[PDB]
C-alpha cells in the first residue's frame, strides 16, 4: 500500500513513543486496513483483531475515532457483513465512527487538518499525500513502542511537501499509479531535483525532456521507459482535492456495555464470561480510574 519506499525515506523523522504517552488524545483509525490485515492472518479473525486492538486502545485511555472507507476512487486498483459486525462491536464499546465519502485516509487527514483529532493511527504512507500532519505507525507491531511522524519534521529534514510527495507517488508507484520501473527513492529524488518547479511542473519537464531525447544523472534518466500518458494529472488532482467531509463533527465516547460485549464475544468467538472478562476488566479499571 501507500507509496513504494516512502516510509523508509521518512525514517529519519520517525520517533519512538510509548502508548502511555497518548492518554486522552483523540486519534482517528482507518479500520479497512485492519480488516484486510486480519483477513489473511479461526472463524472471525477480523473481529478478534478488532476486539484486542480496541482493548489495547482503551487501556491506554486513547479516545479513538474509527473511519470506514467509502466508494473507492476510480484510479485506485472485505464484505459488508464485516463492516456491520465491526460497527456493532464499536457501538458496544461506545466508540464513535464515521463513514468516509471515499478514501478513509483522506478523511483522517481532513480530521487532522481541521484540528478535530491529534493525528491518525495507520500504516498507509498515502495519508501524507492527503495532507496529514501527525501519524502513528506500527501501533500493534512486535515493538514496545509506536512510531510517530510529524509532517513538519520531515519537511524540515527533507524539504518534502505535499506536491513533492505526489510527484514521488508518480515516480515510485502508489494505489493510483504504477510508477516508473527501476526508479527508487534516490532516482526519484534525483529526477525531482534535476527539474525544479512548482506543482506538477517537475514531472512535466521531465516527461518533456525524456520524450525529446530518447547530464550525468540524465545519463541514466533517459534510460527509463515512460508510458505515453505520463504524467496523468488525474492522479495529482485526486491526491490534492480528494472527496472528504470537512464539517465539524460531534464526536462522543460512551461507556462500554459489559453484558452485551459478553454476548458478542460468546456468539462470535465462543467465549464465556470469564475469558471475555480477562480482556475487559483491565480496560474497565483503566477507564473508571
Residue numbers in the entry: 1 to 41, 50 to 85, 764 to 900, 912 to 986
Q: Can you provide the manuscript's text about this entry?
A:
Nucleotide excision repair (NER) is an essential pathway to remove bulky lesions affecting one strand of DNA. Here, we report four crystal structures of the human XPG nuclease domain (XPGn) in the absence and presence of DNA. The overall fold exhibits similarities to other flap endonucleases but XPG harbors a dynamic helical arch that is uniquely oriented and defines a gateway.
For crystallization, we introduced the D812A mutation to abolish the XPG nuclease activity. Two versions of the protein were purified that differ in the presence or absence of extra residues at the N-terminus. Both constructs retain the ability to bind splayed-arm DNA and were used to determine two crystal structures of XPGn in the free state, hereafter F1 and F2, with four and two molecules in the asymmetric unit, respectively. In F2 crsytals, both the N-terminal half of α6 and the entire α4 are disordered. The D812A mutation explains the absence of electron density for divalent cations in the active site, as this residue is required for metal coordination, together with six additional conserved carboxylates, i.e. D30, D77, E789, E791, D810 and D861 (red).
